[PDB]
Design a protein around this ligand. Structure first.
Ligand SMILES: [Mg+2]
Ligand SMILES: [Mg+2]
Lengths: 49, 49
């Protein structure tokens, strides 16, 4: 009509894109504190009971 | 196939045994506290009442 943003929104500037990317859902990670951790030397093995 | 651990599990290494053997259920030990204990001088004896 006059020059206005809604008309020229891709022609005379680009929309701002915020430089920070916003995180998704973050799961609770507890196994390493909540159990005994065996760093095994082999992929298969046994523990004596 | 091409050399993979699931075909040579007892051919090119042994499976790990964990050196820690792991306990069965332990029962609750209380009788020596929960009772008057007589260290007897004889196998058979009497307490007077
Ligand atoms: Mg086994
Ligand atoms: Mg008697």
């Amino acid at each position: 009509f006059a020059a206005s943003d809604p008309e020229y929104v891709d022609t005379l500037f680009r929309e701002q894109l915020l430089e920070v990317v916003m995180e998704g859902r973050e799961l609770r990670k507890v196994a390493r504190e909540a159990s005994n951790v065996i760093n095994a030397n082999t992929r298969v093995g046994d523990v004596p009971i």
